[PDB]
Design a protein around this ligand. Structure first.
Ligand SMILES: O=C(CN1Cc2ccc(Cl)cc2[C@H](C(=O)Nc2cncc3ccccc23)C1)N[C@@]12C[C@@H]3C[C@@H](C[C@@](O)(C3)C1)C2
Ligand SMILES: O=C(CN1Cc2ccc(Cl)cc2[C@H](C(=O)Nc2cncc3ccccc23)C1)N[C@@]12C[C@@H]3C[C@@H](C[C@@](O)(C3)C1)C2
Ligand SMILES: [Cl-]
Ligand SMILES: [Cl-]
Ligand code: NA
Lengths: 306, 305
């Protein structure tokens, strides 16, 4: 029993974190085999951020201008290249702690664990989600750039996020491990405000299914809805449209609880109209949207508390 | 910016988790140097659990009755002993990944990170607090016994909890690493229940300080209160009494924001009496009490390990 925001164990990623220094700037890097991946803005001054010409800044650098530190050992940079918004530093030592891994680009609504790091040293681990507006609600301070987001389904680490910046609203933006930003953001100091965000409907439904599995049904009702009528109501509360793919993805949770997806949609419709009336669902007074259907299946019992 | 329920990095603890099997029961063990620590109830059948005589059950066991597996390697048990509700299995191999550590017993209100484990394999990490009623609101299924709770202080892991059981309300109970239970719980199948819980007042104040640091100020007001008047109000809402020690512990947060502790108490008083009036604080409609003053300082300063 219980339901917590659960992160993957971070040890496999902790063994990959290093510190990268270029002049006066120090940030984090991810060391996998003989390559250290980090944000390309490590080569910039504050002034450079207004309209940086990364190609022109980079050509003026040698391998020995990059200092990479893994614990108390200096690694030697023997090559460098830029791929989109990341810098790839070839080092003379392969990481002996390199886990089995892949680089995966995720979609909005997907969750992952973040290992917040400063000066190449991990400070904490927390869960989060790629918001519909392609930002993440992280907890990051100056010096956290290069910290990564990942999942570890079946002993292989899937790296999906590298941290680059904090936006004016206090939310965060970054790239996949190929250096492609999520959303329309650029690694430039410009007016690029996060778009209006919405609630991840499929995740709220998954979390209602978790509440039922854990033994709570108070929010259910005798009604159903069509997918289209549900979407017309959902969009009025700033909820993402629910697609047939989302209905398919909720199938196993629907089967385990005996509650049809459109029947859970009717419950969600009523919760949006009435609120919770002094009640809580899994210890929360708000509708939680940072648990996916896959996350609920991973954490919850396979036997519903009937 | 941002404020999340953050756990300590778990790698130093992951390298200590092993699987312990005794007959048909499999649970988790913590391997530090040449000893594997696990709940003593690993030696019980379901029938034994109704009324166990642990000394009599243990004397009938040989070292080879305990199967300890570290990854894909069987460790050889060369000795066994019991300390309170914890069994200590001496193994023939010292753990090469043993971190610098201590066994510490925590107080209610203190938080720790849990590394949930099944079959000796870590599955997840989350943060939680020892409730005033000595239970923890964890997330655990059958097979999670032996999973541990911990904090990290520089390079040193302070192990503070070992998971033993789930209570009827879905909350959890366990021991320190010396096998002493937190709470008036016993390791047997008998009628047991969590007592009435209260809210950890000093932690709610620390989280209001975190909200101010993160730019949420709507709940601030021009008023102050005495510690005694605040406690008269707190007692009425099932909040723990606030002591002068709690006021002293909030000093650094009071200095960083410029808001006196009793001034924040006046804000908390008004929140308890009026509710939030449709507003949220750090993305929550409830007053959060599972962040200690040290947790707020650490997250708002970027302390590393
Ligand atoms: O002044 C700077 C310095 N950055 C510029 C910058 C540009 C572009 C790129 Cl790609 C990276 C970066 C780097 C950055 O964002 N670092 C960080 C990352 N994660 C968490 C931070 C929290 C605090 C500070 C930096 C943080 C440094 N950043 C902000 C100060 C404050 C709060 C927000 C929004 C502001 O408008 C107002 C600009 C950030
Ligand atoms: O029947 C048993 C068997 N246990 C007896 C027991 C006694 C004493 C001690 Cl020290 C340990 C243990 C062991 C235990 O609690 N294991 C576990 C630990 N963490 C999370 C569990 C989730 C599910 C199952 C076990 C879980 C096994 N457990 C409960 C089944 C269900 C939900 C609650 C409350 C119940 O009244 C109703 C009894 C547990
Ligand atoms: Cl995805
Ligand atoms: Cl600008
Ligand atoms: Na340019």
């Amino acid at each position: 029993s219980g339901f917590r925001k659960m992160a993957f164990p971070s040890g496999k990623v902790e063994g990959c974190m290093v510190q990268v220094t270029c002049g006066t700037t120090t940030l984090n890097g991810l060391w996998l085999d003989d390559v250290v991946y980090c944000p390309r803005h490590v080569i910039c001054t504050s002034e450079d951020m207004l309209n940086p010409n990364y190609e022109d800044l980079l050509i003026r650098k040698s391998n020995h201008n990059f200092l990479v530190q893994a614990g108390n050992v200096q690694l030697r940079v023997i090559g460098h290249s830029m791929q989109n918004c990341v810098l790839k530093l070839k080092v003379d030592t392969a990481n002996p702690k390199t886990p089995k891994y892949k680089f995966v680009r995720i979609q909005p609504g997907q969750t992952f664990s973040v290992l917040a790091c400063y000066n190449g040293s991990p400070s904490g681990v927390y869960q989060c989600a790629m918001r519909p507006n392609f930002t993440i609600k992280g907890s990051f301070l100056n010096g956290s750039c290069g910290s990564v987001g990942f999942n570890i389904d079946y002993d292989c680490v899937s790296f999906c996020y590298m941290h680059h910046m904090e936006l004016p609203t206090g939310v965060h933006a970054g790239t996949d491990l190929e250096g492609n930003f999520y959303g329309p953001f650029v690694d430039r100091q410009t007016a690029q405000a996060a778009g209006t965000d919405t609630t991840i409907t499929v995740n709220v439904l998954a979390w209602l299914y978790a509440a039922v599995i854990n033994g709570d049904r108070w929010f259910l009702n005798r009604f159903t809805t069509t997918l289209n009528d549900f979407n017309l109501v959902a969009m009025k509360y700033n909820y993402e449209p629910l697609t047939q793919d989302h209905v398919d993805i909720l199938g196993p949770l629907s089967a385990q609880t005996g509650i049809a997806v459109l029947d859970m949609c009717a419950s969600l419709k009523e919760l949006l109209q009435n609120g919770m009336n002094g009640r809580t669902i899994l210890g929360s007074a708000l509708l939680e949207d940072e648990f996916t259907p896959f996350d609920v299946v991973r954490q919850c019992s396979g036997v519903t508390f009937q």
